[PDB]
Amino acid sequence: QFDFRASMHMLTSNLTFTVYSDLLAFVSADTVEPINAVAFDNMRIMNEL
Amino acid sequence: KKMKSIVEDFLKRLQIFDVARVPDDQMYRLRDRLRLLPVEIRRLDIFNL
Secondary structure: OOOOOOOOOOOOOOOOOOOOOOOOOOOOOOOOOHHHOEOOOOOEOOOOO | OOOHHHHHHHHHHOOOOOHHHOOHHHHHHHHHHHOOOOOOHHHHHHHHO
């Protein structure tokens, strides 16, 4: 049978957040001009120029 | 500065060589064994000025 005392409850949550699914559109992304691209050793790959 | 243009012009101005049939690696190997040579004293004094 229905008892109001064992059935009333205060539920708690947040207010107005926003989930983000992509997580990598927030990274602005550029590159060195590829004639100046270097390796791990900071020497230029494609030395040949 | 990619130095294929200098050695390509170098084989242009020699009036014998079919320069469109000499590909990259020979042009760049002429670059490799051409900058081992000392500059003529005229153009060396010009570059010093």
